[PDB]
Amino acid sequence: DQPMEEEEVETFAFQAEIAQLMSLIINTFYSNKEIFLRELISNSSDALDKIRYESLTDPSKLDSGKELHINLIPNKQDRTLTIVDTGIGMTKADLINNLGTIAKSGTKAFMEALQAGADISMIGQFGVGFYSAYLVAEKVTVITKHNDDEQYAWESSAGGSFTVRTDTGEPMGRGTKVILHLKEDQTEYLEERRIKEIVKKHSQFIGYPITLFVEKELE
Ligand SMILES: COc1cc(-c2nc(C)nc3[nH]c(C)c(C#N)c23)c(Cl)cc1Cl
């Protein structure tokens, strides 16, 4: 009897400083956790800038999709909030290199800044705003598709390690989906009014369409 599907899964250890940062973020009390959404939307915007830039000299880069946008998808039943863009996306090497195994100088620098009295809301200036997801999420899954490459899924519950595998569930044209599996006491970020007010407050200058899709699985 053959399996419906099979995926090779790799587990990698986080670089020491990244593990340190994740533990600080996911455990420490902060009063302004809503900034995570600003940081994720900012990373979407950057990724959309990148594919747009590439398309200026090579229009075929948009064969995987011309529309450049950001979607926000709360799912109360799964207790997940997902941010999706049609940006440049990432290769497997990109995921392994840029989401865990190699720590840029900004990682240690950010933790130093916090020790010196800086606020968590500055985290994007250090290039590690992604990890602010763990302010509100117990687990984060990143599904990504780059041109000419297959679709991958990165995942971590911040245990000091993350996994990478091929993802074949729902094929994306191009871009990145960040799925936040929210902590039990952070479900306010699934509410329409909360999402709207955070986007209005922090993302006014993002130069791409941002669209809410409220998700409900029907009985
Ligand atoms: C600059 O650092 C990062 C950037 C990214 C990222 N990259 C691309 C190419 N697209 C994206 N879209 C979203 C919504 C991201 C987020 N968050 C994101 C990720 Cl997943 C982790 C880190 Cl650490």
For residue 70, give every residue at least 6 positions away whose Cβ sits within 8 Å of its Cβ, in sequence order, or none. 41, 44, 45, 48, 83, 84, 85, 206, 208, 209, 210, 211
- Technique that determined the structure: X-ray
Contact 135, 30 (CB under 8 A): yes
Query: What is the Å distance from ligand 1's center to 7 Cα?
Result: 23
Query: What is the Å distance from ligand 1's center to 43 Cα?
Result: 5
Counting atoms of ligand 1 from 1, which one is nearest the CA of 131? 23
CATH topology of domain 1-219: Heat Shock Protein 90 (3.30.565)
Residue nearest to ligand 1 atom 6, measured at CA: 43
Helices 192-202 and 35-57 pack at an angle, to 10 degrees, of 60
Resolution of the coordinates, Å: 1.7
Give, for ligand 1, the residue of 45, 83, 130 to mutate: max count of ligand atoms closer than 8 Å to Cβ: 130
Contact 51, 141 (CB under 8 A): no
